Design an enzyme around this catalytic site. Sequence first.
Site, PDB file in Angstrom:
ATOM      1  N   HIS A 113       5.311  -0.592  -6.674  1.00 42.80           N
ATOM      2  CA  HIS A 113       4.352  -1.709  -6.815  1.00 42.80           C
ATOM      3  C   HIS A 113       3.003  -1.351  -7.486  1.00 42.80           C
ATOM      4  O   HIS A 113       2.637  -2.164  -8.393  1.00 42.80           O
ATOM      5  CB  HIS A 113       4.072  -2.340  -5.500  1.00 42.80           C
ATOM      6  N   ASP A 160       4.493  -8.652  -8.203  1.00 38.88           N
ATOM      7  CA  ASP A 160       4.275  -9.202  -6.779  1.00 38.88           C
ATOM      8  C   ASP A 160       5.597  -9.641  -6.213  1.00 38.88           C
ATOM      9  O   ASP A 160       5.964  -9.041  -5.166  1.00 38.88           O
ATOM     10  CB  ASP A 160       3.154 -10.181  -6.948  1.00 38.88           C
TER      11      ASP A 160
END
Lengths: 122, 122
Positions: free
Chosen positions: A47, A89
């Site tokens: 991420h 996301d």
Amino acid sequence: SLVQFETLIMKIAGRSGLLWYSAYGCYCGWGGHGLPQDATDRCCFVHDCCYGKATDCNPKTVSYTYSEENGEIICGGDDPCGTQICECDKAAAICFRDNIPSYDNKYWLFPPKDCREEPEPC
Amino acid sequence: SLVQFETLIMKIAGRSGLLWYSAYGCYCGWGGHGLPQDATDRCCFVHDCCYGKATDCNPKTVSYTYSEENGEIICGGDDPCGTQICECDKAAAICFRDNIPSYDNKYWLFPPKDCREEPEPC
């Protein structure tokens, strides 16, 4: 945004980011060091690495638009740098939902003391 | 960048940001929730509100320059958003530096679940 990030994690993962991952393993919080402790810890690393490819916007204040259609989330908006953070996301919340089965609380509130190696390339 | 933030903290506060501030209080890690618990958590509250005013670059990966000028660290960069971010980080290490007397290990690896409180405006 982070607010947008948290709401996709509940929508998709059905658990709070604050309470289930803000302090999970070596990378979900501060980050920057250590060896990925497991799958969920790896979701986290992947991420930051993506946020990492954005150089034009603040990954935490940038706000985007998403639509959901036939149970699929679609990223969008008038900011290509935002669109790009939404996609990152999206993938971290799916990433999260599918590694729940191996989630381990032994990695909850993981002491930074144990996360000193040098991170791996992105 | 993160790696430069971390150097500021060691260089100005005299400690491992990873090991004295990466998991402290409600805001030193993920943030966005609860109430600053003390002098130190609040340095990370404002640190975070500081990065929220930078809309054109990524606070975590933008690279700036800093200089030692007689007890002082002087901020620079290739561009305005890069300089902007140095200052956020410089101000945070100075606040860390100076609330060392009130540092409490009770807010070290602080359960998120004690940070459900809604945040106050930056």
